[PDB]
Curated annotation (Swiss-Prot), chains A, B, C:
Cellular component, GO annotation: extracellular region; lateral plasma membrane; plasma membrane
Source species: Homo sapiens (Human)
Membrane topology annotation: Multi-pass membrane protein
Main location: membrane
Keyword annotations of the record: Cell membrane, Disease variant, Membrane, Phosphoprotein, Transmembrane, Transmembrane helix
Gene: VANGL1
Organism lineage string: Eukaryota, Metazoa, Chordata, Craniata, Vertebrata
Subunit structure: Heterodimer with VANGL2. Interacts through its C-terminal region with the N-terminal half of DVL1, DVL2 and DVL3. The PDZ domain of DVL1, DVL2 and DVL3 is required for the interaction.
Name under which the protein is recorded: Vang-like protein 1
């Protein structure tokens, strides 16, 4: 395409530095003999190592769109460009123009090119993968609706790359954003809007409704959970592993005996918008095929679950906004705050530094662990 | 042994390329002088670096037996074999046969060998340790008895290596498989086997036993836990840190005042098969020696605990089976399912891909956070 | 300073090996021509790569004080010292003394120096960052007051570096040490000290106070939590995002309507020593500025929270003591125990080895998942 063509040009540059004196002006070249051929073999093995490493670490599609320019890949592209153009200029001005008759020096120049390309590959993987390993900072990520918070540890990243790592961990650690679990407090606040220090005294002696409503709601959730467990066990017990039928029709056969209890449990825990009937039938046939217990079937539906269990059009990644005060290409430091705003919520992330820890030693004699039975 | 002998041959190959013209046919060699000696010193430092790195990253026992052939170590062994045999053939056909009189070229050939061996070591650690760092995929691992599930993040691994990482995390994250916590549902299902849409209506209006049995069982567990805490505190209070006695006899002295309450708590939570009396005495003497609180002693027994707290003959690793549809040497991709079957359960693992995330920016003026006290 | 001056000397050593024959004794040097100049260009690019990599991975302040000497950095410093002193001795005894007239060999000697310095940098990052990646051991860390325990996975570290990783994870995973949550058991033990097998029988039939005290305390905590949620919602509802006022004065305006309920909740959960009024006002203005819900404000105060949320003078890192039996520079192995003693508690850490896992395969026909509706 584009980058493959430039990679082909960089890969064929040392070979083109080799092949041109045995093509253009053969009648003048001194015989290299056994000096040149071992250099050719070493060049071939180093080009093979470079091709295998380049395929291993750089033949992959990009994974994110970052706001500003990525600094280190730009530095690597400028370095490779100046490097290859400088070698082509030195080959064209001195070697190819004046027709430098010793072929040994041209082969050694090409071997030095292949060596420096190998060290460019090493510097590339150092700048892109090894500087971020040693944990220098910690990050607190708080979602600004339910308050759920996680800590992470990162090295020397930029604000872009740290935000990308936080967004990687969001779909894995945090539960899915449920807007129906939040209206019960907003309706309560708008009910308080219908009607300072002295009023706060009359509030705490005036029969808290919230405790009894939470207790009654937890009792209803546990009762619906118990009836769901009974219905799913007595529904799974109706099929035998061996009329012969595929697992989709077996799921369709055992589903109408568990359907209404599951619908009532999804309504009582406010999860009815995440699970269609086709999703439940696909997961049911999945658990039927793999040979799973009814609790292994129900574990997807009992809890809230993380963001990436669900359908691909329910979680969304193509609209994230990075609110920050400084430039996002700057590295992390102690005491900065940046916000990852989604369409309805936000992840407030603040960074602290891992402190300077001083260790020392004690020399405890191991025979001092002998003691008595006196009343302590 | 075997691999140490081949490593010794690879390490002594450049030195043998050096030493043979100053042994066999000394009377013909031109004087190298100061050109050769700096190359000898650079060769010695590069061999020292190669030996230290080889000891640092490859002198260790293998950790797993994988079903099919490992692809990357086979590629590295084929690469090293073809490399060393090609250099021995080029040394024997051209240099040693024709007796190439310039010793400088032979020393430069050996230095090129040591350089290419260093880049082979670099390519080895790239293929074995650096390609798996960047998280490309996520994995859902569900145990098919109680439904307990974990998410993990992996890079470009094969199905073998991903299964090995899942089995690493199983002994650390998941609680131990307890078959006695599962018979209460199978007996209930077999009781339902003693005797579709209309029958599901009569079930949900017919006095759920499961909720009241769970509530009564939780009350009994909390009462036995309270009496266990009282017994363990009043048992630990009978010894003083200072008849002088070692911690084993102190554990034997304070154990008969906590033994029956611990036995009743292990029976009520169905953990009596995991903890013998000798295990409890060893852990008791451990917590006595290190100076730990009674709750620090009881935390091993209150919860279920992960798989690797227990005895080595209770968790088992020499029988795992990898059920998969495609070849297990293939890399991970989006939407595949593979099963790790143990002797009594299974880990169903399905792989999803981390999505393409698009970040953008907002430019919020920091003086817009000034606002009013009007009724919202 | 000191290390920057030595790094400048190491960086200027190859350039000083280059520049001295074109300064001291110019009248004798043979013309290098086009052989030397490509070596100069390759030398310049390799020095640039070395400088960028050295800045990327070694220009940072040290993060910890370890008890004994660090082995691998000492090995790297001895290696660099012997390397640079050996090249200066070989340059002074042979090249500079005898005035070696071929400048090509001197330039090749300098290029070999730059190559071996690049491999020294590679060996440095291998010994310091890559050997610890592959998980060989697991670690159980138990805090010896409340019993809270975590498992971690580490590679081939020393006891110093493993203790540093455990202390990194302590401020992130473990909740903060609260000494007021521990006196209720010590007062109970001292009450039992006011007054063996037969006495343990009379205890378990004598009205456990602890269960009813825990149930009543949990009821009081839930009631104070409910009134706190009501007070914080009706306090946040009194401001509108738009007299115009900054968020500090908005926090001061809405704080006296939530203050007493928060004070009662911090007293009932024994957290009144961690949160001053200024900390609550700063966090309140933080959540007001970022636009967070009242539950997002309260999540800092509802739970106990990890160690590093709080003030820098509350958690302490400059007094940790490493109690161990063997030398702390030794590597990890299976079955060792070391203790990290803080001023009032201790982390007992014991190390187990990740077991040798044997995988095999099953070949299940995918058409065997067709089955019947017979009564199981």
């Amino acid at each position: 395409t584009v980058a493959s063509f430039l990679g082909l040009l960089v890969f064929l540059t040392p070979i083109a530095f080799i092949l041109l004196p045995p093509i253009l002006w053969r009648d003048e070249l001194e015989p290299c003999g056994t000096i040149c051929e071992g250099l050719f073999i070493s060049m071939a093995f180093k080009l093979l190592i470079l091709l295998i490493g380049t395929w291993a670490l750089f033949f992959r599609k990009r994974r994110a769109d970052m706001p500003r320019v990525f600094v280190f890949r730009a530095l690597l592209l400028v370095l490779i460009f100046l490097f290859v153009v400088s070698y082509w200029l030195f080959y064209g001005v001195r070697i190819l123009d004046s027709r430098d008759r010793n072929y040994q020096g041209i082969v050694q120049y090409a071997v030095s090119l292949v060596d420096a390309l190998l060290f460019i590959h090493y510097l590339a993987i150092v700048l892109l993968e090894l500087r971020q390993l040693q944990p220098m900072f910690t990050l607190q990520v708080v979602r600004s609706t339910d308050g759920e918070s996680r800590f992470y540890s990162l090295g020397h990243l930029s604000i872009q790359r740290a935000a990308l790592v936080v967004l990687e961990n969001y779909y894995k650690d945090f539960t899915i954003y449920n807007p129906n679990l939040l209206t019960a407090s907003k309706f309560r606040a708008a009910k308080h809007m219908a009607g300072i220090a002295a009023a706060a005294r009359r509030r705490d002696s005036s029969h808290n409704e919230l405790y009894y409503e939470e207790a009654e709601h937890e009792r209803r959730v546990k009762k619906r959970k118990a009836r769901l467990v009974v219905a799913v066990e007595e529904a799974f017990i109706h099929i035998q592993r061996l009329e012969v039928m595929d697992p989709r029709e077996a799921a369709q056969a055992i589903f109408p005996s568990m359907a209404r209890a599951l619908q009532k449990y999804l309504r009582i825990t406010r999860q009815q918008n995440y699970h269609s009937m086709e999703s439940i039938l696909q997961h049911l046939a999945f658990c039927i095929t793999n040979g799973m217990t009814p609790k292994a079937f129900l574990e997807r539906y009992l809890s809230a679950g993380p963001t990436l269990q669900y359908d691909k059009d329910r979680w969304l990644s193509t609209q994230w906004r990075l609110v920050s005060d400084e430039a996002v290409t700057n590295g992390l430091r102690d005491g900065i705050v940046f916000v990852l705003k989604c369409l309805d919520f936000s992840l407030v992330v603040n960074v602290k530094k891992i402190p300077f820890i001083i260790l020392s030693e004690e020399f405890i004699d191991p025979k001092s662990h002998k003691f008595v039975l006196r009343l302590q």
